[PDB]
Design a protein around this ligand. Structure first.
Ligand SMILES: [Mn+2]
Lengths: 143, 143
């Protein structure tokens, strides 16, 4: 159940997110996901969102928004309150590793190409720090 | 039922939206809502989104994203597919007029202050062109 696409029915998650001014996977892979954290320092797990495309290489990618799940007021603009709507999701979870990232993205991409699915959201990249290493849940909404 | 806050339970609307690079109400009031249209020319009604705050003046405001309801593929990034989640909304509809805009915003703002409600989204400004004049539906998600 780790390193393979599954389709689940998620409930809705409330989040706080902001614009990911330029930053992309290429930058996080040149460091740690700790980078995104910085954008949202103003919950415990964080994430990024990016347009779903059949990318042929990381460089083509660029994140759109950095977000964090919530659990509320006194929030400035430049930070938005939204959710990750309840729905059917194609998910692929793995332990973070540069080599893995692109590879898994490809699996998800292929999984949707075949199965001729219809995506209705961006790819959500959820980072979950594992403290005894990162856990990554890549998912995208489908119809 | 026109020019007063009501709370309804909307279903979910699928939309396409983009970043509203700087643009705000102050600019649309100096022209027509036709301005926003331009941002999303790449449905029939369009809209804008902005952070919910107890604004004391239009100038303080700046739009966040311009969007349009949908009804699907071959979409570039720089354009995002999302929704206006189903939920309970505090809505205020009126016929567009510069004088009205701020005034009604105030009503909605007051309505939430009293009633001590909890908003969980940005203010959605839905523009509906009336062709025999504009119709504006200002709404924000509540808990
Ligand atoms: Mn945005």
């Amino acid at each position: 159940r780790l390193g393979e696409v599954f389709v689940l029915d998620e409930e809705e998650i409330r989040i706080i997110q902001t614009e990911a001014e330029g930053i992309g996977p290429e930058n996080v892979l040149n460091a740690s996901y700790s980078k995104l954290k910085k954008f949202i320092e103003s919950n415990n797990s964080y994430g990024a969102t990016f347009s779903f495309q059949p990318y042929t290489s990381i460089d083509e990618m660029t994140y759109r928004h950095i977000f964090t799940p919530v659990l509320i007021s006194s929030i400035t603009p430049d930070m938005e309150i939204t959710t990750i709507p309840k729905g059917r999701y194609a998910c692929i979870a793995y332990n973070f590793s540069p080599e893995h990232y692109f590879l898994n993205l490809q699996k998800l991409i292929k999984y949707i190409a075949d199965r001729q699915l219809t995506v209705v959201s961006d790819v959500y990249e959820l980072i979950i720090p594992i403290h005894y290493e990162y856990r990554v849940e890549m998912k995208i909404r489908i119809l």
